[PDB]
Design a protein around this nucleic acid. Sequence first.
RNA 1: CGGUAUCUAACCAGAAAGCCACGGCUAACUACGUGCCAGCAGCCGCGGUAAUACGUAGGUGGCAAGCGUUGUCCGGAUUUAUUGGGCGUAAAGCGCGCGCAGGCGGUCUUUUAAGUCUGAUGUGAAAGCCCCCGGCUUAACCGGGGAGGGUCAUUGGAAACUGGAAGACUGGAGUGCAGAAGAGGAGAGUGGAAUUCCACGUGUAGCGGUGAAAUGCGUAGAUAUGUGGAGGAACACCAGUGGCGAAGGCGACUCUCUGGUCUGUAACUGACGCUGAGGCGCGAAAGCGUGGGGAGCAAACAGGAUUAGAUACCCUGGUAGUCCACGCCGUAAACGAUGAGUGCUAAGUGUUAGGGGGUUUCCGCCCCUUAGUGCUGCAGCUAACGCAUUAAGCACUCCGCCUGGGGAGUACGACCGCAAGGUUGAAACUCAAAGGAAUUGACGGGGGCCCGCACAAGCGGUGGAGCAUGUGGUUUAAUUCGAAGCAACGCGAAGAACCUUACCAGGUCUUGACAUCCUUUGACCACUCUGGAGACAGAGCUUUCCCGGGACAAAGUGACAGGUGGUGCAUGGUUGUCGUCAGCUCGUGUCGUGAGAUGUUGGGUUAAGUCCCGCAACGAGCGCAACCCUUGAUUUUAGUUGCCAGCAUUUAGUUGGGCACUCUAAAGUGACUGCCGGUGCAAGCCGGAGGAAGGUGGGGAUGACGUCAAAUCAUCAUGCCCCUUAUGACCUGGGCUACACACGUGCUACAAUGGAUGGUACAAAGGGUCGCGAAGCCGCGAGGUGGAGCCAAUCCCAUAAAACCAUUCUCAGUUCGGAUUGUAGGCUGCAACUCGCCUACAUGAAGCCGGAAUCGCUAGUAAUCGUGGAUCAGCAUGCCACGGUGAAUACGU
Length: 204
Amino acid sequence: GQKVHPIGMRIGVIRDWDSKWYAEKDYADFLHEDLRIRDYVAKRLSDASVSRVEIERAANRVNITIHTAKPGMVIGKGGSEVEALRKNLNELTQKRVHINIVEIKRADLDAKLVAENIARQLEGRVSFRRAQKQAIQRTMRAGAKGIKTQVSGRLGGADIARAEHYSEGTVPLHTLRADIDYAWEEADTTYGKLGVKVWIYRGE
RNA sequence: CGGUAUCUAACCAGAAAGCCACGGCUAACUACGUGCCAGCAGCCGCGGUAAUACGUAGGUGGCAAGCGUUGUCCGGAUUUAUUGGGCGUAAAGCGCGCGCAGGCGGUCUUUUAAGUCUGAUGUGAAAGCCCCCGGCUUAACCGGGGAGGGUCAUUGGAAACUGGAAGACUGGAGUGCAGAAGAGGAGAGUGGAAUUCCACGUGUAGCGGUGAAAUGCGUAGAUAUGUGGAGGAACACCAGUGGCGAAGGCGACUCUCUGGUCUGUAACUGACGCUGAGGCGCGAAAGCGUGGGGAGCAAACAGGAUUAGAUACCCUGGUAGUCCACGCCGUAAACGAUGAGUGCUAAGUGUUAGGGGGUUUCCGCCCCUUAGUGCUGCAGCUAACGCAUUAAGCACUCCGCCUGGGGAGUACGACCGCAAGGUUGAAACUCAAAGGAAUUGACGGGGGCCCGCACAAGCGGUGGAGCAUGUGGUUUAAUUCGAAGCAACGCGAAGAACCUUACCAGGUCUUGACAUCCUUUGACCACUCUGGAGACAGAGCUUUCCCGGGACAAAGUGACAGGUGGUGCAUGGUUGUCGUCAGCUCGUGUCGUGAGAUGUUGGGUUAAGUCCCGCAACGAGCGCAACCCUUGAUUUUAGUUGCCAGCAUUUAGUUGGGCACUCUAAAGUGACUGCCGGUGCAAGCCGGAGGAAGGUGGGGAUGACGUCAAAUCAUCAUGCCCCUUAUGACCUGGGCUACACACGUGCUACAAUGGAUGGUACAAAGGGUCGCGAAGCCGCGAGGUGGAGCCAAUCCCAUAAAACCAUUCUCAGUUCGGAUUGUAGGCUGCAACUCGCCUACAUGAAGCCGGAAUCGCUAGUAAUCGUGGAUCAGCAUGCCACGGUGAAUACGU
Ligand SMILES: [Mg+2]
Ligand SMILES: [Mg+2]
Ligand SMILES: [Mg+2]
Ligand SMILES: [Mg+2]
Ligand SMILES: [Mg+2]
Ligand SMILES: [Mg+2]
Ligand SMILES: [Mg+2]
Ligand SMILES: [Mg+2]
Ligand SMILES: [Mg+2]
Ligand SMILES: [Mg+2]
Ligand SMILES: [Mg+2]
Ligand SMILES: [Mg+2]
Ligand SMILES: [Mg+2]
Ligand SMILES: [Mg+2]
Ligand SMILES: [Mg+2]
Ligand SMILES: [Mg+2]
Ligand SMILES: [Mg+2]
Ligand SMILES: [Mg+2]
Ligand SMILES: [Mg+2]
Ligand SMILES: [Mg+2]
Ligand SMILES: [Mg+2]
Ligand SMILES: [Mg+2]
Ligand SMILES: [Mg+2]
Ligand SMILES: [Mg+2]
Ligand SMILES: [Mg+2]
Ligand SMILES: [Mg+2]
Ligand SMILES: [Mg+2]
Ligand SMILES: [Mg+2]
Ligand SMILES: [Mg+2]
Ligand SMILES: [Mg+2]
Ligand SMILES: [Mg+2]
Ligand SMILES: [Mg+2]
Ligand SMILES: [Mg+2]
Ligand SMILES: [Mg+2]
Ligand SMILES: [Mg+2]
Ligand SMILES: [Mg+2]
Ligand SMILES: [Mg+2]
Ligand SMILES: [Mg+2]
Ligand SMILES: [Mg+2]
Ligand SMILES: [Mg+2]
Ligand SMILES: [Mg+2]
Ligand SMILES: [Mg+2]
Ligand SMILES: [Mg+2]
Ligand SMILES: [Mg+2]
Ligand SMILES: [Mg+2]
Ligand SMILES: [Mg+2]
Ligand SMILES: [Mg+2]
Ligand SMILES: [Mg+2]
Ligand SMILES: [Mg+2]
Ligand SMILES: [Mg+2]
Ligand SMILES: [Mg+2]
Ligand SMILES: [Mg+2]
Ligand SMILES: [Mg+2]
Ligand SMILES: [Mg+2]
Ligand SMILES: [Mg+2]
Ligand SMILES: [Mg+2]
Ligand SMILES: [Mg+2]
Ligand SMILES: [Mg+2]
Ligand SMILES: [Mg+2]
Ligand SMILES: [Mg+2]
Ligand SMILES: [Mg+2]
Ligand SMILES: [Mg+2]
Ligand SMILES: [Mg+2]
Ligand SMILES: [Mg+2]
Ligand SMILES: [Mg+2]
Ligand SMILES: [Mg+2]
Ligand SMILES: [Mg+2]
Ligand SMILES: [Mg+2]
Ligand SMILES: [Mg+2]
Ligand SMILES: [Mg+2]
Ligand SMILES: [Mg+2]
Ligand SMILES: [Mg+2]
Ligand SMILES: [Mg+2]
Ligand SMILES: [Mg+2]
Ligand SMILES: [Mg+2]
Ligand SMILES: [Mg+2]
Ligand SMILES: [Mg+2]
Ligand SMILES: [Mg+2]
Ligand SMILES: [Mg+2]
Ligand SMILES: [Mg+2]
Ligand SMILES: [Mg+2]
Ligand SMILES: [Mg+2]
Ligand SMILES: [Mg+2]
Ligand SMILES: [Mg+2]
Ligand SMILES: [Mg+2]
């Protein structure tokens, strides 16, 4: 049995899609500009635990906000790394780009950030059983009513692939008033390719 | 022996370390090579292009002057069990009795001293094991002393136990006396139902048989029916986990001859007993010999059916046999799968044959007791099932039997038999299992409830024809690759003329078509001419960068790039399918030696493990339901590009005017078993009212744990393997469109509910800026010119078609059908031959409802008719959406 994408099921119902701009006859021109912007942000800020990026476009001006769990590298004492973004985005956007940075409180509640921390341990030769369990017990203190995660692929170096999942709490997928986050990430190993799936039933 | 052992003097780290294993058993793991090959192995078993198991290295682990392998013996092996096992179902109780030898044997007294216990003497050599000392520089090794070792011989004691002898007793055993029950056995005779045959009345056409039939019997008169005769076998009701017997077994009645058992008494004898190898007898059915008998039944056999075949099941016949006398045979799931004797160890309740007591006149009820026969259950036992005073519990005596499976109850030998065969009973070889009980699933041509267009009741199709399209096969330089029952086959492909294109022919390039870092200029090109099929080769105009920075470009080099090359059985992600089926699990608790179980089962109800009640369980999670969208009714907000009530005007809702009504879209109401009646205890069920809507209203989105090593390395990503002057890169042409053929999916028809001609009405949902494209004019037509308006509730696409109204055709291969083909055109595109779509004229094919088989659909559904959109320069009979008209049937499982 195949499951619908939990995020996609709730667009426009309880949540709102990330890129929120309106234009006609410039749709494909604007849309692929965003796909370029996201590609560069995900490159330089690979270790900054960045999860949510949205595009706010209005009359030749590009407004972008970055949701970061640890903005200290992104902004703070240096005060010069964030300005390089506007200098490294003017060449491809060709528009006056302003970037905003927003703190993420309780970073363990965000399904995006939990995903790579599980993932980063898998190529650190950590057992798959331990890595998931450690993240499950960390998020339950944050205030979530549900979590279940699986890791699938050539598991622990095994020749035959299989999946393993661990759950505790309440994760009702079929409920539409759920507010369930989702994230999928790649674990790059020397025996193959592994992927992790995490979804959290948030509080409200 | 022999200048041997042994001392002291000096020089030298210098001459002196190998063997086996590293998956588990079992201490010790990583690389490379190979790729079910080479090979390894004591067992389990490893090797099929990431091997801790094969080969070699590095490292490690056991020992060490060694270390491994083989052969033999003991151990582990309780696997011959005296110490120290067993026989209900795993191997293992003879089919049963009578009994010689042997083994074992109630209570007391006296005696004896064979067994039993004990002392002394003699001996059991030396060496060896063991204990205490001593010598070799230690040890091994060697001495001194001691100990142990016997069913040993002579002799002295003890008398409890077994044995011997002499007596005594009665709880064992047996006799006597008084009763009782019984299909216990052998012999002789008799009875009644019923079947068959025979003879004679009555009578007419079938009888008999099967899932259906047929063979067979009958007009030579059957079946049926009434009367009489002959003969053989078994004994209806009674009849009962009732009775009798050692077992096999014994069922009509009477008599004769016979065996055993139970109860009561306490007269009698006084251990006279239990088991019992060899031996001797009995012993279902079939079978054998001799003489009878023969009604039903029936191996063999014959015929008829069934079947792909049917030496069978089914039907019609039928010989030995079954019955009797005598004599053999000696087996059985001969079973309670449980040897015989004896004693002890909770209860509850039926029944057979007796005895005692209390109530009562009897009857009857109750209690106690003996011997049998059943059921339920404690302790105990058991691997479990289960047994449980009729033990598989606790004990003693005697007999029989067993030691992994097959070979095999076979071969040879012997005994027995008339024969068939019986009894006794191996080995070579081969395997690492064979087996008992219970658990979770699955399966059933087992059973009980249920659901789905599953069948049934209907309607319309496919399979027959022409064309469209995908696939197989085949042909081709190539016909690029993938999917293969449901769950590939108008599928990836929501568009193959060049591109796409992944394939082929020819022509070309090697840091390259695409990115990074090198170094000099900084713009680099573009264009024109020539050879050009083009890619590309040779010349000129210009290359203006901007701000020491830069991205690209010029130039050659490297690191490098590039693969739609392989493996979907190395993978991530994505999807199908069972199936929108109602299930799948967990936490704590409890039961079981254990795997497991319970919850999740039982009684109702539901679409639903949806809910209620009960319950050794109490709760939870993913699923169901609801929350989401859409349609159906309505209120407030809002009147523009929408609408026109009431108006004046216009060819026309037009213009002026107004949101009245529709309308559009934001917020709300509304449906929740809400209410009433009956039924039920509750869930719930049936009906009714209100309402637009009533029982999850209609339709969508939503697809649990998992199964198919299901599909995709070709959307993307990616481990390993492979190619790299090519398996990478550019150009033209061809091909993916072939064609004797087979299959799947569709379109059009085979006409009169129809064809043709003329007039006219009624929609919804969408698209439009390098776009839609009107009026007007032209052409028979496809189309051409033209440019209005529209960045759109405004303008265009855009006249909806079936339907309705008139005329004509008159049942024919036709005024049906349109394939096919010749000519003449239009449109896109640089280009329409391979290979596009449309128009005009002419040609006019198969086809007159489709065999076997098979598909879809339950209401605005099927059926039928039009419309729009994605991909798109052009091209859809495919796909995805929209509306018009609008059925038949559902008894039922
Ligand atoms: Mg000398
Ligand atoms: Mg010396
Ligand atoms: Mg020295
Ligand atoms: Mg070990
Ligand atoms: Mg290897
Ligand atoms: Mg080994
Ligand atoms: Mg090796
Ligand atoms: Mg080595
Ligand atoms: Mg060593
Ligand atoms: Mg030594
Ligand atoms: Mg040796
Ligand atoms: Mg040996
Ligand atoms: Mg032994
Ligand atoms: Mg045994
Ligand atoms: Mg026994
Ligand atoms: Mg057996
Ligand atoms: Mg047996
Ligand atoms: Mg017996
Ligand atoms: Mg005797
Ligand atoms: Mg005695
Ligand atoms: Mg004796
Ligand atoms: Mg001696
Ligand atoms: Mg000494
Ligand atoms: Mg000695
Ligand atoms: Mg000595
Ligand atoms: Mg005595
Ligand atoms: Mg004496
Ligand atoms: Mg007596
Ligand atoms: Mg008798
Ligand atoms: Mg008799
Ligand atoms: Mg008679
Ligand atoms: Mg028939
Ligand atoms: Mg007659
Ligand atoms: Mg008896
Ligand atoms: Mg008698
Ligand atoms: Mg008698
Ligand atoms: Mg009796
Ligand atoms: Mg006497
Ligand atoms: Mg006896
Ligand atoms: Mg005998
Ligand atoms: Mg006989
Ligand atoms: Mg005979
Ligand atoms: Mg005879
Ligand atoms: Mg026959
Ligand atoms: Mg017969
Ligand atoms: Mg006889
Ligand atoms: Mg036999
Ligand atoms: Mg026998
Ligand atoms: Mg019997
Ligand atoms: Mg037996
Ligand atoms: Mg006994
Ligand atoms: Mg007994
Ligand atoms: Mg009894
Ligand atoms: Mg053997
Ligand atoms: Mg054997
Ligand atoms: Mg024999
Ligand atoms: Mg013989
Ligand atoms: Mg077995
Ligand atoms: Mg079994
Ligand atoms: Mg239905
Ligand atoms: Mg056809
Ligand atoms: Mg193909
Ligand atoms: Mg289809
Ligand atoms: Mg080409
Ligand atoms: Mg030039
Ligand atoms: Mg030139
Ligand atoms: Mg697969
Ligand atoms: Mg349902
Ligand atoms: Mg269960
Ligand atoms: Mg139930
Ligand atoms: Mg309901
Ligand atoms: Mg439920
Ligand atoms: Mg009511
Ligand atoms: Mg009603
Ligand atoms: Mg639902
Ligand atoms: Mg496969
Ligand atoms: Mg495949
Ligand atoms: Mg690849
Ligand atoms: Mg094709
Ligand atoms: Mg016509
Ligand atoms: Mg043409
Ligand atoms: Mg014509
Ligand atoms: Mg014809
Ligand atoms: Mg006709
Ligand atoms: Mg088109």
